[PDB]
Amino acid sequence: IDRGTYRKAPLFEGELPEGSYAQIVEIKPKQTVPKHYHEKQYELFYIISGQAKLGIEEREYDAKPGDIFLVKPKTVHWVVNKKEEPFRLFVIKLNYFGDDSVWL
Amino acid sequence: IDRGTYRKAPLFEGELPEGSYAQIVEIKPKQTVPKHYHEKQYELFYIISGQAKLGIEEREYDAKPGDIFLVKPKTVHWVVNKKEEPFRLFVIKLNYFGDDSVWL
Ligand SMILES: [Mg+2]
Ligand SMILES: [Mg+2]
Q: Where, by residue number, does Mg(2+) bind (chains A, B) (predicted)?
């Protein structure tokens, strides 16, 4: 499914307990996902493939395959894919009740 | 941390919302994790490395790196590591309130 700066594929759609969601995300080639935070949800990310700058709060990380991150609620985050390869991650949302994104 | 047939490393210990837990598991070389089910918890597994037979209910899967599985509550499951390499997975527990394993 296309979302402009990224594509997403839901995993086990409807089979996870209320409050949880899982998906594959691919940040497109050379794309920035700009600064945003979630009001309620937590996000766990497992990096499958590619490389990107991943920003959480004041820190920017060199995200590489095998890395795992946690983005807590009301924590700004962003991604800069500087490569021609998609930046692919396995995403688990927790305390998730629908879109709660604030874009800056 | 050693658990006999597997080793585990908690991830973001204490930072996840109540009801959720994350860890790295490594099923040891050549080891079987025998049939068991959870009363309440759901388990999402991302296979990092190695190969194993993963049983869920009546189905046995050839689990390989990149595969993702969901084990629902009160669903029997088991793993047979036939390789000398550890079977390494990223595990997210949902609807998780403590050890609720029934071993058969
Ligand atoms: Mg986010
Ligand atoms: Mg289990």
A: 38, 43, 77
